[PDB]
Design a binder for these strands. Sequence first.
DNA 1: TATAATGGGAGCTGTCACGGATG
DNA 2: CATCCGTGACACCAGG
Lengths: 346, 211, 208
Amino acid sequence: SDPVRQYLHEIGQVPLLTLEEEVELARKVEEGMEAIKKLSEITGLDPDLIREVVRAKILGSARVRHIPGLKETLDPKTVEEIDQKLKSLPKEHKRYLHIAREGEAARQHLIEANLRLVVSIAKKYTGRGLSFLDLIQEGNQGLIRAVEKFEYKRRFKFSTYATWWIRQAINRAIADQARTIRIPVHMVETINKLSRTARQLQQELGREPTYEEIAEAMGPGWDAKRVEETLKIAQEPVSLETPIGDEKDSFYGDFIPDEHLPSPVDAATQSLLSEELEKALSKLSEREAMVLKLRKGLIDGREHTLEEVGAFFGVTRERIRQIENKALRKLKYHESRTRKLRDFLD
Amino acid sequence: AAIDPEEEVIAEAEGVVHLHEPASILVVKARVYPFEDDVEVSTGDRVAPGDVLADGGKVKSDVYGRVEVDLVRNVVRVVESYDIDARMGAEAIQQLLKELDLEALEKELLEEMKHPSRARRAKARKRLEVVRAFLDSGNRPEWMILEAVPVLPPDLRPMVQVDGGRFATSDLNDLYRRLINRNNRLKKLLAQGAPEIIIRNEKRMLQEAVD
Amino acid sequence: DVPSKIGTLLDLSATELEQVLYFSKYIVLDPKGAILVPVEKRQLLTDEEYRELRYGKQETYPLPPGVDALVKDGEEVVKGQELAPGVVSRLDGVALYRFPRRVRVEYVKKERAGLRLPLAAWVEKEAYKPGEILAELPEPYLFRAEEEGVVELKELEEGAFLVLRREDEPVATYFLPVGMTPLVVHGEIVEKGQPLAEAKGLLRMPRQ
DNA sequence: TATAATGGGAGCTGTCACGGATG
DNA sequence: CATCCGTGACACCAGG
Ligand SMILES: [Mg+2]
Ligand SMILES: [Mg+2]
């Protein structure tokens, strides 16, 4: 019914670890990584492929998919081939495969045991743009990173090292996803710094600060125009479905006129313009009308050069330029006489 | 062993070892199988009775279960469990919908239509109407499950700049962004070896995003 | 959209279809000979019911501080069999130790010792098992040293060991089985012929 | 990147008819 | 063959 309730119930199944169980799991994970490295030393294969095969066998055939960094599409046939290449090893070599399998099996439970910490940390990041469950999943990703980066020799409990990566992942997610118009993480840091500076300035001034006071409190390089540009660049969009009125029959988008598609007046004026241009070009000879049409793009879109029009009509570029000039002159004369094209110039 | 070498325990002379005072005791429903030679199956493998365990084929499997190679105790343990295929979600439902012969079920429901019970005849008719809709139309039932979510053309969910130079946009963009973020996080969680709880939560959130 | 066009085609109710679609229960597609009554296809298994079938049944119990176990590592167990003076197992199967907090090493020691006894008290044999009577004395007898040196008294659980050394070099190794009360302390100086112990009545081998 | 940290928190208050579920 | 429950639907234009 309530997905947060359901997740908090599934999390309450894996029991918390006693210090001994925690240290044992971390040690198995580290020794399994070492064993994967040794297996890559022996086999000459790629360590990532080996880790993926061990991980697949520990998880089962329920999850077998292509890994981006792997050069080979990881399908059960290839994982069986590589598991056979690993099975055809001496005893003192296959012991490393055993160690790797148990290391992956320990990594799984090490994550599942501390999944509660992610919830207890992510509950404090609500309201900042992401759903509770999105925060929880990003914290779980951070927890995976912390598992793969832990070192049990330092005698620190796992929570101390895990909280750092959990916070890191939650904050990176908030920075990367909480804006419809995505803003780079450094610019989000700058905009948050600007917000906090303005807030402290208002807490000391009894009013909202101006651009100049914020630029003061921001340090060197910050003028008023930079503060204004930073505030403008951080404006989030508003919903086209925003309600207008108490009755449920008006949206904010209902009042935004469409500027892209031409109006009936625009299309009709363009059509009459093309027709009047053809009427004015027919008063020329075929060659000079065609020269202007080729020089301006009314034929094939683009504008040709004097050399192209001259080689197309079989004259010198000077001659094609002279007949273009006389065509324009006859058009100017006809326009001064009839004035049939002036109103189109606005 | 220990963290640093000056904390280890090295046996001074010949002797036998005895374990006492455990932190906690674990009672498994498993089956022990000690071994002496090169073991043929690694940890996590699923095995049925009569399968080769270790020692070139000497020791074999007695029960259904999962392999726990124990190099410390030098025993190939097996904990009772079958390789039962049980899924969750639209994946399982799409499987069941794909493996569905429409004519066979139509025949079963027609047989059910001759039952003396009125409610059973009614429910057989209600099922058979859907069956015959799919039959006469040509639509596969599994198509009721989405693999490729369509995306509406952008001009029908605009990102427009209002007179004030600010932007106004449609809600479908935020719903699609929810969907895409959750989908990408699921693809990455699958790329890595994320455990069951996490992947399950992610798939549930993805389904509710599509909803 | 009730009645569901998916739940109707598969004879799945609204509740079951929600439980499967939004990840609350499993649905079997090929039970591979599972048994919970054997598992029939299209059966709703809960999370506990799925883990008991896919990953086996187990449990872990806490031992209070300093309390030793009443069972041993790797040994089978019956349900209800008390695993410890404060732990009763709820199931049957192979018990396992997680973290032994005390390792006891019984070291092997094969040495050579001596002992002098009156002939009318001996019980002649080619060897002596533990607990076996070595002699029976009608009167107290004083086992006397046969070397001069410093006493290295090494008491076992029952019975003792005496070693004499002149210049820190071992010169005699005597054995005092049960029934012999050593009359010397560690590091004592002894001349030839002085009482090192007193046997009284029966004397037998120690159990260790 | 390392002390330890291990399960959330609102909710806020029609009126009828209809078809399906259950009991 | 009933009761209970979840889910639909509940006037138009105007200005907002
Ligand atoms: Mg400044
Ligand atoms: Mg209106």
